[PDB]
């Protein structure tokens, strides 16, 4: 009972049924009528008849994104499944909303289509909708939406026409409306009757309306003349829950403070590329906003400028519930204790992003200063040494890694000219427990002095540098240091007898992640790395093919806590047994992939009694033990896809084989001895080239009878010979 | 009479036989008697003995470098029966030791990256007749063996390089006739004044790498135990009047003594890069004893950790009259200003100032206007605001700034600083200049015309790798003799959807000849027609010709009347229309478009480009070729189609065009040269026809084709190693002309 083409699996106590991206021309009818959930997007699907989903009763979902990769839909072609709420169907070409739509609809999706029209024939039936998405479709010269053609959805929470030539907000909308988006939608004007009964409306989008034309990965034209939106006084009189307003890229050049004047639960105010640096310097409107907790005002620069100073209006004061203040691209060359004064006193302030402002010179000292500050932002600036379901204005990935930013206060000053670590570097700064110096040219000969004033630094990523850390002594002034970050770096003054030295790894009692990935690392001098707290080590892109010399064979064995081990990209052809061997018996997991691995013996694996994953992808073995079995009784998977594996040899803790991408040509019924009790839960074999002959008849009578082993991409797993077969999968035979 | 595996060639009244890289085993016994120079390097050469070289008298040069490449066994007297051989190149060839039996007439040996360690009487006291002796890279044995006097009877000896060695000590009894001596990274930490007792006539001598400061070098690097520096004696350079080029590079320095140039009044060329004389550069007692000095380098002399706010010139700096360039690279300071420059203002030859990877925050830019002959002020790698072991290891040799870019006049490199924008006092107070180099400092200025206003006579413009947008009609108008516009790499930052791209500007210039708009994703223009009355080469490779061709952009290039070197390569074209490349300057003498994914093209079409000498098609997929080439063009000299699908050569393609003379066919799918496609009885000059990685047929249809090869001489085909057929099995591998 092994599905094809979908691999079907539970989810919340329902079936459901993956067939995305499989090459399908029509809709399958070998799919499992228990399923709840269809998704077949990514496929060259052309029809949508009544006979598609044929006895798919309990369909609540179905997703037909991208179909082909324009589409035919019949006139009530899903009005068959009662049960169906959620309907996806984006990039489809198709150039009128479908007639026929079952009423249970409460999420449906049209975007990317060829749209124009918004009838009550295809919505007005759908009074069950709660949300609707109809972007990006005249992008006719305006969209024809019908008069009250929303009214009738009473139940209607998210209403999104953005990037469609509107020009005018749609009249009679409904009154349970939570959340309007309208971004990009050549509306230059707004006034009061717009939203006269959006009493319940939480978010409006305005964004894009009259732009400030910057970097935008759509179509971009300004309103003539520099004209910015023009909103009326009383526009925003009757939206009392409005929480969310995005205001980005509408060329405003001033706030006026009347249109929250009724709105006190603002908590999201997005003003990203506009003109208000005078705003900024007077902002009448910033009294108005007591509950804001995130402020955007970046990328509002005036061109040609580069002013000595920002100019922090004392009203910031007034934003007593802040939580976060976005400055980017303000431009300015020095950051002083006194234009951040209005700042200071806000209790919730814990992200001040000043990112790509080109400061040259900021007095660390202001940051003692406040009062709750846990992300410091100051990437892309000059200082020197001591999809349209994104949001495409706002900053929204993590401005540090999650994982540094879990370490406390975080100071980021990667991509900046700090070309060397300077006596006064860290001096007035905070307790600092995560810090980036990512992409700095810096050539700090690294002695143990140079992060004293920031001793509790736990989690530090000196990535992309020229540094030289050959010293013993080197960052051993952070006692508290669990990850150490050095890929990408190129050491710039090598010593022959000396450059690499990694005493200074033996220091560190907490030390859990070290990434020396991309170091260049031919040459060492002790010979081995001691550590008893490290855990992870990340050697990849180095040159172990040139240390394994009889004098590297122990480099790891001090490592005796290691349990993580990356040794990919280091050229390896052999692994010498002995220097194997001398790899740390606590290792867990060890990836050997991308390498040009020969051979491998399989026999080293008895000293590793707790190895549970083995990654040899991207090699060239053609070799496979015939007794793994009394080697290792720990090992959960085996990875070994990009091989050259043309043979399975023949004869329990193991659940997952990567086979695929090999030179296997069949699998013969000596190698299929499954009496024992082997617990194997998953099979990869796509990417061989197969031979569709009564051979490969003894490997489908296994597939049938251990149903189990899950063998995914059953599309892919195609047998190049016979021409009658080639093309097609190994599970469509005679 | 075609020669194989050498392509042999006259020069001189002497022939030279290139035969290196053919992938050959052993020495070739195919190689003309007449030659005077044989090349067989990069091969897999084993042996070498004395019928290796049979019967070729006249041989003056060997050139046996790298053999094998991935040892070599030379018998004793392998090479003296060849009375005239002058110059014997044997590098990368693993020697244990120097080889025995060298004919006495050499005078030029090289024997460099070998496993030499001793330095013997046998192979080197016989060789009287030595000019030129390289040995470096072989004790790089504790020590290089070097026996007292084995140089003592080479009275003829100009050139002895003993660099990267493990020397330790200068080799005692060297002859008086040498003129330049090499010692660079020898271990010698040392230096007495009896090391260069009779040495007189010696003009040059390279003492780099002595006690080093280890910074990026590319061989091993090892410092002399506490910090120490080369122990140079007080009297070590005084019997080297004639001393021209002294390098003392990477040597650890802290302190120069003035008596070392006492008497060295010629000396020229001093390099001191990678010491720690930033006290002498501010003292500089040494520097009143080079009155004729014109090169001096004192680059990476840095103290680490130290960042200075102005740079300490000494006074002394104005007694270097004959200064011509001074190399102040890695100083690292955070400004430069008027009065620090002082002691270099008044030297009337000084013409290069390289003061590149310095880190300065602020330049006045006025003082550059007090130097009495400035040419070349190169400035990248600093942070401006807006407003191999024949190798020179340690002095940066290529030119800093383009020679075609220094030829206009003043040249200023301003590149990888801070110039995010042109600021209003960005080029004031700046001399004349006419070479502006501004590349990759994140520039997203809005050109409007008004930017170069201080600097107008720039003639050579370099805006590289910057995000500037140039879409105002008025934009660079203000530099009226612009003649070289580089705008490579730039990504626009502020598209507006029916503006971007406007080449409008273009237009504007009464004398612009070179335009580069090579990578700048020119997907969409605005009238869409580009005019241009001096224009001559135009780079338009890494656009989006496909987009703007599939028909309001079918006459973009129509208006450029006087262009002749266009570059369509990169442009992903499937198909040019045919309107499109009517539409093309008939003026143009070289087009390419290749790189693309060409199926079919035009040949017709040519007819209308009577000027028409080189036509690139190569990296495409086309696959037929007219049979009246002859008909539409009578001007092409060069036709480039290598790396394409052309699996068939039409009858008569070679018949009736006498203008072309290279022919490239070469990573082709051909199969076989049929009789009828060979009709030469016309006058075509067909001078060179490339034809090597096809997949020939070595059967008896390549039979016709090969007596063609014999009776057309004149028609050169490189490569012969390289034309290989595929099948038969039989044949597989081996060349074409090694046939029955
Ligand atoms: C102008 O400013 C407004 C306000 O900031 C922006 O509005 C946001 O727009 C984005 C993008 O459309 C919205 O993001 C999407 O939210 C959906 C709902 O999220 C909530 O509910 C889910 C559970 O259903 C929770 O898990 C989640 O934490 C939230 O509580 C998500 O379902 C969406 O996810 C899908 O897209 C992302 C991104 O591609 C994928 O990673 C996911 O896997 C998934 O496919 C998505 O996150 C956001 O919710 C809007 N804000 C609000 C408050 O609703 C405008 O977009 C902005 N305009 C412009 C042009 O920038
Ligand atoms: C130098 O070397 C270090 C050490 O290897 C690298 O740091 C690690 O980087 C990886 C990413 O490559 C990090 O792993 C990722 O962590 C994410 C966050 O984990 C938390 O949240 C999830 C829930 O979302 C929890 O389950 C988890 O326990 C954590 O609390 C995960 O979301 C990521 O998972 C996704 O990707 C993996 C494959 O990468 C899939 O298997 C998952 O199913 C999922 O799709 C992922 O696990 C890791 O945390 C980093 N370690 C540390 C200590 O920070 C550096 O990146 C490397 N530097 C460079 C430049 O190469
Ligand atoms: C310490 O400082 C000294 C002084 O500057 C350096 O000495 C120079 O070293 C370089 C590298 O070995 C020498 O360069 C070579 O010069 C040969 C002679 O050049 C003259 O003669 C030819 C005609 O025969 C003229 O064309 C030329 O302009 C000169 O007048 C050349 O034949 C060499 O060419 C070969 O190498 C180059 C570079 O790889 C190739 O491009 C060529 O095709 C060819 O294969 C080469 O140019 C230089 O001459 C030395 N100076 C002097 C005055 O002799 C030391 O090298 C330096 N030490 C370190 C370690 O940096
Ligand atoms: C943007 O576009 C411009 C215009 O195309 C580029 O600038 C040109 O770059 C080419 C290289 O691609 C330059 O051509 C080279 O010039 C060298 C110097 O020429 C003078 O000296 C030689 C004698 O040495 C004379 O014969 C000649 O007449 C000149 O007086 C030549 O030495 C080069 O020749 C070598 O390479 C070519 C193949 O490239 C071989 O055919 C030769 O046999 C030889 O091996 C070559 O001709 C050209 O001069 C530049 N022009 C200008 C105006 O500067 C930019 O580089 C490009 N920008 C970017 C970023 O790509
Ligand atoms: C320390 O600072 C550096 C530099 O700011 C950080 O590197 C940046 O990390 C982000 C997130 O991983 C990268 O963003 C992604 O880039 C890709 C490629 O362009 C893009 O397709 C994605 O949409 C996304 O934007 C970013 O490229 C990368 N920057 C560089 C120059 O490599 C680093 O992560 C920081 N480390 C910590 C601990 O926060
Ligand atoms: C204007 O300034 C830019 C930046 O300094 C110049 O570009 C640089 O040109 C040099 C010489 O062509 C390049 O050097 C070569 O680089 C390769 C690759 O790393 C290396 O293998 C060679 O040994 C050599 O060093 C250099 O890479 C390139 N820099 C960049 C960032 O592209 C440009 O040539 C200048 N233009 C003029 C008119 O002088
Ligand atoms: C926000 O104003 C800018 C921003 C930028 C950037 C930039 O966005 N960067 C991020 C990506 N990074 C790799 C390079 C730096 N580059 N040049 C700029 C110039 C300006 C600017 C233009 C005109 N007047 C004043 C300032
Ligand atoms: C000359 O002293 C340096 C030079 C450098 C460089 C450099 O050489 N660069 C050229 C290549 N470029 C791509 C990046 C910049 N990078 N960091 C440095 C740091 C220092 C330095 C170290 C210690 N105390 C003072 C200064
Ligand atoms: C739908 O699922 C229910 C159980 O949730 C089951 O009783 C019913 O028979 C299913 N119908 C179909 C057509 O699968
Ligand atoms: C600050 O944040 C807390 C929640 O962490 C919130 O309860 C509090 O009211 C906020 N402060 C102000 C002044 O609103
Ligand atoms: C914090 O800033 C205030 C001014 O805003 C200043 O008076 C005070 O001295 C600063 N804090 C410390 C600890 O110096
Ligand atoms: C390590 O740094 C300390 C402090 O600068 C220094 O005393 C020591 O000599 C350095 N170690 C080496 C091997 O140079
Ligand atoms: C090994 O590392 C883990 C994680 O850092 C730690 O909990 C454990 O105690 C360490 N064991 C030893 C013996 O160091
Ligand atoms: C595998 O390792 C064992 C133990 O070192 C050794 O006896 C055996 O010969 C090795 N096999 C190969 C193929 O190297
Ligand atoms: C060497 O060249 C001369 C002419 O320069 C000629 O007379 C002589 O015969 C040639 N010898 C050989 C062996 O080719
Ligand atoms: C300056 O250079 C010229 C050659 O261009 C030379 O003749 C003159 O002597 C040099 N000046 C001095 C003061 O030596
Ligand atoms: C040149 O510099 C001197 C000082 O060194 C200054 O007095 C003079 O005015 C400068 N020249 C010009 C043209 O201003
Ligand atoms: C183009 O440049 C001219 C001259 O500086 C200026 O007057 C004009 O406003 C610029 N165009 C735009 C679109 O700003
Ligand atoms: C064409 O360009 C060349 C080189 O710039 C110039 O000498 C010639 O006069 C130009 N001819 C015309 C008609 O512009
Ligand atoms: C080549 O161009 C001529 C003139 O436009 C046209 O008649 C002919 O059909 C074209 N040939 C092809 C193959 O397009």
Redesign the interface.
Do not use: E
């Given at each position: 009972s092994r599905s094809y083409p979908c691999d079907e699996k539970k989810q919340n106590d329902s079936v459901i049924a993956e067939c995305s991206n499989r090459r399908l021309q029509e809709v399958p009818q070998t799919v499992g009528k228990y399923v709840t959930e269809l998704d077949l997007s990514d496929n060259f699907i052309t029809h949508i008849t009544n006979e598609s989903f044929q006895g798919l009763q309990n369909l609540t979902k179905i997703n037909l994104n991208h179909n082909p990769n324009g589409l035919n839909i019949t006139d009530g072609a899903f009005l068959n499944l009662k049960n169906l709420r959620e309907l996806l169907l984006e990039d489809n070409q198709l150039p009128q909303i479908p007639s026929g739509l079952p009423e249970s609809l409460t999420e449906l999706s049209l975007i990317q289509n060829n749209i124009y029209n918004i009838t009550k024939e295809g919505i007005s039936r759908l009074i069950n909708l709660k949300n609707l998405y109809l972007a990006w479709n005249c992008y006719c010269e305006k969209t024809n939406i019908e008069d009250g053609v929303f009214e009738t959805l009473t139940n209607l929470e998210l209403l999104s026409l953005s990037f469609n030539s509107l020009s005018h907000v749609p009249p009679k909308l409904p009154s349970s409306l939570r959340k309007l988006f309208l971004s990009n939608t050549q509306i230059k004007y707004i006034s009061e009757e717009d939203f006269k009964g959006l009493i319940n409306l939480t978010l409006l989008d305005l964004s894009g309306n009259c732009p400030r034309?910057?970097?935008?990965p759509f179509?971009?034209?300004?309103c003539d003349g520099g004209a910015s939106i023009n909103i009326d006084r009383f526009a925003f009189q009757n939206l009392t829950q409005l929480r969310y307003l995005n205001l980005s890229s509408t060329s405003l050049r001033k706030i006026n403070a009347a249109w929250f004047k009724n709105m006190p639960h603002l908590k999201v105010l997005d003003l990203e590329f506009n003109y208000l640096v005078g705003e900024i310097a007077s902002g009448a409107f910033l009294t108005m906003l007591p509950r804001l907790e995130i402020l955007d005002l970046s990328f509002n620069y005036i061109?040609?400028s580069?002013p000595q100073h920002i100019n922090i209006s004392r009203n910031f004061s007034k934003l007593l519930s802040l939580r976060a203040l976005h400055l980017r691209g303000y431009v300015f060359?020095e950051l002083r204790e006194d234009d951040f004064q209005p700042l200071m006193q806000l209790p919730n302030l814990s992200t001040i992003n000043l990112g790509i402002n080109?400061i040259?010179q900021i007095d660390f000292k202001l940051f003692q200063n406040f009062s709750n500050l846990e992300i410091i932002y100051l990437s892309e600036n000059?200082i020197?040494?001591?999809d349209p379901h994104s949001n495409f204005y706002h900053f929204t990935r993590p401005l540090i890694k999650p994982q540094c930013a879990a370490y406390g206060k975080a100071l980021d000053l990667s991509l900046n000219?700090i070309?060397?670590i300077?006596?006064n570097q860290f001096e007035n700064l905070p307790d600092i427990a995560c810090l980036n110096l990512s992409a700095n040219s810096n050539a700090q000969?690294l002695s143990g002095t140079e992060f004293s004033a920031i001793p509790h630094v736990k989690y530090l990523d000196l990535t992309n540098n020229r540094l030289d850390f050959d010293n013993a002594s080197a960052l051993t002034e952070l006692s508290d240091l669990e990850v150490l970050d050095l890929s990408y770096n190129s050491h710039?003054?090598?010593?022959?007898?000396?450059t690499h030295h990694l005493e200074f790894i033996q220091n560190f009692t907490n030390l859990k992640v070290l990434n020396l990935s991309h170091n260049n690392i031919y040459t060492l001098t002790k010979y081995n790395l001691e550590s008893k707290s490290l855990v992870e080590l990340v050697f990849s892109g180095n040159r172990l093919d040139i240390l394994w010399d009889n004098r590297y064979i122990s480099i790891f064995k001090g490592l005796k806590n290691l349990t993580r081990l990356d040794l990919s990209l280091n050229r390896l052809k052999h692994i010498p047994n002995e220097a194997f061997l001398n790899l740390p018996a606590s290792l867990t997991e060890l990836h050997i992939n991308d390498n040009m691995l020969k051979f491998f013996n399989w026999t080293l694996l008895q000293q590793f009694p707790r190895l549970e994953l083995l990654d040899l992808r991207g090699n060239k073995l053609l070799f496979l033990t015939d007794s793994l079995s009394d080697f290792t009784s720990s090992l959960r998977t085996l990875l070994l896809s990009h091989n050259r594996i043309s043979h399975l040899p023949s004869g329990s803790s193991l659940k997952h084989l990567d086979l695929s991408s090999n030179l296997l040509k069949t699998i013969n019924k000596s190698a299929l001895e499954t009496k024992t009790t082997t617990k194997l839960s998953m099979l990869e074999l796509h990417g061989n080239p197969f031979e569709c002959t009564c051979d490969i008849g003894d490997f489908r009578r296994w597939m049938d009878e251990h149903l189990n082993v899950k063998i995914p991409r059953l599309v892919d797993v195609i047998c190049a010979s016979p021409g009658d077969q080639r093309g097609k999968s190994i599970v469509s035979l005679e």
């Open positions: 034309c910057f970097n935008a179509p971009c034209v300004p061109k040609g580069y060359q080109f040259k000059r020197s040494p001591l000219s070309f060397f300077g006596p000969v710039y003054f090598r010593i022959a007898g000396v």
